[PDB]
Amino acid sequence: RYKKKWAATEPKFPAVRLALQNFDMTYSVQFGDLWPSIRVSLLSEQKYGALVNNFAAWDHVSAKLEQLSAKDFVNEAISHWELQSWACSPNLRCFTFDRGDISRFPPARPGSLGVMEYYLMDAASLLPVLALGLQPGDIVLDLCAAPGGKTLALLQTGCCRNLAANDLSPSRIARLQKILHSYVPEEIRDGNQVRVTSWDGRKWGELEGDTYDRVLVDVPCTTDRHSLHEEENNIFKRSRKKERQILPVLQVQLLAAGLLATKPGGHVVYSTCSLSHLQNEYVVQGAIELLANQYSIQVQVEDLTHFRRVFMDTFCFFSSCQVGELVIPNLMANFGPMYFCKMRRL
Amino acid sequence: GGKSSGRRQGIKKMEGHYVHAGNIIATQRHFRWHPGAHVGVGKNKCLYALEEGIVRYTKEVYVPHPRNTEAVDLITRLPKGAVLYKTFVHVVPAKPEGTFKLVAML
Amino acid sequence: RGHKGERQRGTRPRLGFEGGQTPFYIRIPKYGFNEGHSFRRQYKPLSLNRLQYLIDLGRVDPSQPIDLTQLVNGRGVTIQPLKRDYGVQLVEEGADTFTAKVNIEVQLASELAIAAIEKNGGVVTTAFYDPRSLDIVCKPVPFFLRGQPIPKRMLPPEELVPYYTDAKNRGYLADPAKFPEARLELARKYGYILPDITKDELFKMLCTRKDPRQIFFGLAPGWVVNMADKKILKPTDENLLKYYTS
RNA sequence: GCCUGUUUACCAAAAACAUCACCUCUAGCAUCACCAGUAUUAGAGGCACCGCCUGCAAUCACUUGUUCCUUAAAUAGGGACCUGUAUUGGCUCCACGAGGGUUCAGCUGUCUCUUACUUUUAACCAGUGAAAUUGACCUGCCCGUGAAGAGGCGGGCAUAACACAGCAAGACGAGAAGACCCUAUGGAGCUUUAAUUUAUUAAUGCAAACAGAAACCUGCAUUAAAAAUUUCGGUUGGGGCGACCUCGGAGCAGAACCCAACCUCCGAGCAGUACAUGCUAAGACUUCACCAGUCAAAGCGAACACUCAAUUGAUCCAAUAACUUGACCAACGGAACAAGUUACCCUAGGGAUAACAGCGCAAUCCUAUUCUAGAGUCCAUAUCAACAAUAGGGUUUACGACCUCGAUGUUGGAUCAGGACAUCCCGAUGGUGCAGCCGCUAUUAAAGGUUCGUUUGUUCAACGAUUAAAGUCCUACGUGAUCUGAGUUCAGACCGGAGUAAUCCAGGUCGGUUUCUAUCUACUUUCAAAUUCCUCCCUGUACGAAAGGACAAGAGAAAUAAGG
RNA sequence: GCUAAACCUAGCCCCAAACCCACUCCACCUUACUACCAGACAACCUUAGCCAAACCAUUUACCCAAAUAAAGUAUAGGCGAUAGAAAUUGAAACCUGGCGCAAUAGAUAUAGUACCGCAAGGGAAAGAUGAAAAAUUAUAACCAAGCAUAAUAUAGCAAGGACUAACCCCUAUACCUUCUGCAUAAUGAAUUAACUAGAAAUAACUUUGCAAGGAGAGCCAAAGCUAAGACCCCCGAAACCAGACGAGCUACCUAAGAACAGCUAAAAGAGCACACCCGUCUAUGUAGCAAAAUAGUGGGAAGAUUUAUAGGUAGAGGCGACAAACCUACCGAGCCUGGUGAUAGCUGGUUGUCCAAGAUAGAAUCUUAGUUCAACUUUAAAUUUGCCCACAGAACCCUCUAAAUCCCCUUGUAAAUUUAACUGUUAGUCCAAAGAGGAACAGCUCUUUGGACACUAGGAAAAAACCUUGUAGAGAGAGUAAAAAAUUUAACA
């Protein structure tokens, strides 16, 4: 029989407050004096970048955005490659506002083709797609692709002949299908070019070995932006405490499976929307040791310092990261938080 | 979850049963039984008799429609000489369409 | 009474209660099935088979004009003015076998029933009776025991005026000049030779029609029937005469 | 705890309340209170005199470890040191107290260990004469069985009748539908940011009504105040900080249908294409009822029953000219709108249902064999033992909810014990890595015995001194109509913690009603066989190189036990 | 043969009719029943709540002045439980009665007395001769429990089969109720007598009258209509509201009083210690002396003391050195009366005989202690198939390639469906089998098939679930069914 007369009961905290307390302890030591600056940006609403849909009237949309003083940071960054001196995924146009500007883009309006003119997404989430260095004729595998923040960006490039978008949750997958349907014309999705499935990412390490040249792996993680604001399906509630404990374990397993899926000589980018170093660098180091000990697979992590300097103008970067690149949010540049690490298989 | 009850789907008219027009013959989730002579199929693969008569079940050669791509791709990979079979439910009409009766003597 | 519960203790719930779920009758949506049921007009049907049955047995004499009083007096109909009855309606049942020349006045009449009577040489006229005068017509004897002067029946309501002002329905307020034209159309439609009732000996009896403000035959409104002394009292006040004649 | 004082009349006299002292809050004044008073006054509170104290966080208190004193023995009492936390707040001091602990000497039948006497009671004779109680009884023991604890059933044994006096193991003894958990669309108190209201009260505003400005009154409003009404969804979960409630698919459910969880897995609360996704109408299916839900020929009218497993919400009502539309009513067959707490609790019931117990079961626990790897210098088997195997036991921890919810609180102790032998001691006998003493191990043996103390409510345990030994258990975890009431358990209070509060607590502290006249069974002198240690002698003998050091038999002395 | 038992009146109930009483003398609103002095004192103000809505919050019938009819209609209503007209219609009418009661009945009544409570208020019990008691030589017999006459003899639900015979022999696990299942150590009952618990006619059915009409205005009618017969319990809360009654106990206050030896000390809420008050500890007592006491031991005892007297504060409250204390011996909200026969899905009870049919799918539910519907069951009625079952036939991704169903002519048989009218059961058990959860444990939990059990008997020791076996009586006949455990083990070159 249950006992309902406990002497002391733990006070009920909101899931937002629960997430805030855990982040406050962990991230204060990790970031030091930058945590108060980061914390305000996390609590403030993030800036939304307008990703131009190439399938629609991209040139006309670009002219429309220029009227709202929007500036294509991607086009500016491309010209910066030679200025500083794999390159990056081409055919991406995302317009944002100036540093410290709070203006919000109007909601997207379907064009004459019947597809949305542009997609609103975090500008920090576009970097892993750019860091992926996509090239035409490649076969791209995306794990946890739903709801399609990075999935849509791959199709805008037009460099992927075959795509494998897999997310474990069918509800997220259903959102991905609608986003692709509304934006990407049916002709591309008509064939086997875009394959949307709902299975465990751990299976991809065995079912499809060395099939894909470019693999983008965004494992699930404690989303700092969503946890501090959303009250639904928060990972920090008591019922989901078990999932948070086993969360780093899944991050190591899903990343390792994706590394097995890629062909030797291919590129794999590990992406995570969190500031916790125990889930950003340790997971990356965990997968590297896991492959060598169990499957004897060696990978090399590329240097993103060259990539860091190009987007320093429009993004804030943390210069105390062992392997990956971490983009921390700021009041002037609200994009983030985003962590992306690029490793190639040899 | 998974507390859903059964849908009570199956054979409503067995072999040799006398049926009338519109009577439901069988209800199925998938095409376990295929419509035969004077047997219609609804949206939910519900087989109903189009004519009054006796219900018969036979095994017939299955030739899919060319427009149905999925079934066409299945017979094209079969070894030469192999033929697919499926169960078909037929209704053999019992009464004729009508009779000619004398009505007047002009 | 069973074992315990509300059955043995006699605390059963009200009729229609289903243990807590929404009752069957409650969950059915409301519709205007019976809306205004107490204001709808009801008419007792009178078949020509019933009318011919009464005539052959002598319960209704065809030599005299037939009104609602004669039908009630012959136990042919049972009118309930308290039950929103407005008279009798003549239906077409048994029109083939009907063969009698009568002068019957009914509140409503179908086109075929009108044609059947006029084919045999009869006369059919439709008049309106208000509920107050209806009880007087059905049971004159109880009304004469109240010691009240006979009131004039009121005109039909605004909705029923078109029915009684049209010669097709043989309304009692219709223009008599349009009756010959309407009578011939029924003869042509149903294919029967319309007899000339003027040459008939009963022509005077057929033409006998009561005034729209009159209740009985030969009894002007305002008169007081004294059944104890077999006498009728007629007021001579000028204002009273103007009230009972207008 | 300042003190005298006060409180639960009938279980708590206190650490609780009050109390001078101090602090805070409110109020500028007349004609029943305050008060016939007026800021040195009055009222509403907190703390409990007095004295002392910094930083501008120290000092202290609390806390985690360590040590010392007392005792033969100290989970107690007293003091000191280390760590952490906490701060207006904290620390001392008289006196005092039926308050709660420790102790010196003394005192004593409190005890070792009881005994004698008187009185009452008692028993008998005489008089008077109750009460609870009672299905009927012609009222036995053992074993078994059974709704799981039998005087009544099964199998054995015993058995003339019969009163009186004792006894308290049984009659799950008697006494208040007992306490204890649970149930109810049963109550009540209390608290509140539960819901529903401002009638009432007070303060403003306007209207009214006036003067010429105002007040009173009345109406309508808005603010609060103080109250009023009512409710506390189910499901599941002993060590938590909840999940779950509707709909669909797969396994169980293997082949027509149907078929459950705490079950085993994945989801759905949409989107897209249509715009005849128009109008009508035979015959059928139907999620086991109903409500809903599904298919559909023909016909009319046009062209030349949309995809999808789920993708959904009834009635009333509101909106609307109409057509139509409206609820994570998600507690999803939906109440138009209501939360906690009760140990101050009350009523109706429940062994359908908890804890203790009994019973089932043997995961755990326990024991012996089988196996022979491995320890034991060599060597499986003097001993010891792995992976396992084979059986037994019902002492722990669990699991089951079958019996008891119309008077057993449980633990421990005192008293008296009956029984098992898987033997702690005494006895007999193999083996030994048994020289002798000591030991180890195994077979046999239940006739007899199995201590006194310190802290602790203790069971247990720690160590104190002993003993041939200070056995493992069972018996309603024996025994409470024999006793005890210390711990826990009802009302009081405090410390710490939780909560806005009421109030709560697996913690600490203090106090707290233990009824009964014996009707029945059983029993009330087993007429009487005793065990053990030490010393001595054998004997300083056998043994041994010495060191050491025995058997058996006999004697003496002492102790307990039994009987005088 | 004692106690007893009987014994019919008193009187009452319901109607009718009629509109009722209230100054002999004296006393009586002050402390009522008190002869006899200066007063000023005034009545009027919505009922609420229980209860029903299965909670509850709007709401929920209560003579309002003519029976019937209109009519349970119009309307009202969380449009829901339920509430509910009017116009209009028009009624006879003779008090002197009883298919009422007969001392546990009928009024409580012999009496609002005795008695109980401070008060409001509650509220009894019983009598029995005869013409004559101025016949007591009286009103004879028999009859409940309880006794007495007349204690008891192995053994056991107290009996039955019996028997020459009481016992001895054989056989037999009290009753009611509640549960799947009670000899059960679960409930109730000491016993005797009396009293004490199924009220309603919408539909349907049955039997008459009349019939396309029926009916003694209204109403119904596509064979109906009228009339009759025939179905719907008792006791019990804690509560809520209204109006009264209570501070002679107690809590505090007011008025005016009383008490406190002696000693030590000092002008003390001082010390010791009587009266007095209080009730710490222990024992006795526990239906007691006592619904809180006795004995001893204690605290205070010149004060915030104790105490007599009168008055005050009254329940939505008082009062409180706050103990949720006290407010007339059960105060987390007094008592009494009324609403009230409150309500209770809960507990208990539910009265003569005999026969017949008669058990385990579910769904919904502020619902799992209930109810509604279905299933099942019963009666009546109509009709024709029902059950058993030969082939044929019912899926693939899937070889646990399962046992076996569904369908189903013959055939064996006699039921089945539909119509009408409603009740009741559904907190199930165990065994075999398949499969889940637990531990390849449980008299464990949860589905499925089948059996048994709640229906008798025999056999397994006693025995609800295993086996045998059912349709009912008598016999001092007969044949059978199931039905009684086996097993004793090591030489060796």
Ligand SMILES: C[S@@+](CC[C@H](N)C(=O)[O-])C[C@H]1O[C@@H](n2cnc3c(N)ncnc32)[C@H](O)[C@@H]1O
């Ligand atoms: C933080 S979201 C990333 C969304 C997307 N990658 C983007 O950046 O736009 C991680 C997603 O991974 C999916 N996921 C969680 N567990 C997964 C698993 N085991 N295998 C595949 N996907 C998983 C979840 O549905 C979740 O929506």
Ligand SMILES: [K+]
């Ligand atoms: K007292």
Ligand SMILES: [K+]
């Ligand atoms: K004290």
Ligand SMILES: [K+]
């Ligand atoms: K006893």
Ligand SMILES: [K+]
């Ligand atoms: K509900």
Ligand SMILES: [K+]
């Ligand atoms: K008892």
Ligand SMILES: [K+]
């Ligand atoms: K119930």
Ligand SMILES: [Mg+2]
């Ligand atoms: Mg299922």
Ligand SMILES: [Mg+2]
């Ligand atoms: Mg009962």
Ligand SMILES: [Mg+2]
């Ligand atoms: Mg004190």
Ligand SMILES: [Mg+2]
């Ligand atoms: Mg002092």
Ligand SMILES: [Mg+2]
């Ligand atoms: Mg007391």
Ligand SMILES: [Mg+2]
């Ligand atoms: Mg006391």
Ligand SMILES: [Mg+2]
């Ligand atoms: Mg105090």
Ligand SMILES: [Mg+2]
């Ligand atoms: Mg004192």
Ligand SMILES: [Mg+2]
């Ligand atoms: Mg001493």
